[PDB]
Amino acid sequence: GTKITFYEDKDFQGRRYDCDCDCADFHTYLSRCNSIKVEGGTWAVYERPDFAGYMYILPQGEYPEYQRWMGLNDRLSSCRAVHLPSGGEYKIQIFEKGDFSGQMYETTEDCPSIMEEFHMREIHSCKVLEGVWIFYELPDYRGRQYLLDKKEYRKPIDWGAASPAVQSFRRIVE
Ligand SMILES: [Mg+2]
Fold this sequence. Notes:
4-stranded antiparallel beta sheet, 174 residues, 14 strands, 1 helix, binds magnesium ion, repeat, 43% strand, 3% helix, Gamma-crystallin S
């Protein structure tokens, strides 16, 4: 089913931690993470316990360095499998201002450049009408990532961002 393996060293070496479920805190077991194998499923992995700090989405595959999942440092402490919609539906509303105010756009497609498409480089609230999405701090799915797997986000901090910068977004698909 869903299975992920974390390694302390690059190239799948060093101490290993395995998770086949949600794992809110493995910080006392693994002191650093430099490679991952996702045997099955799509996972959200997090820098700090209880799904906090930097986060990253990893589908099935082999990741011999943290840079391979766009990791921003060597620290991972928690993880959870992403629940994708069984009916495969995806739809999001993005808003210029907080609390669902200002200009709104609705889309069912990915967006590698919010500036090109919508003339914005910040998003201040969002409703995830269907499915599961990721916001990115930089264009074209680069930089820090923010998982949007809840229904409503009133302010950027609701998706884990201290900065309102969002320059691309996409769906997490099977
Ligand atoms: Mg779950």
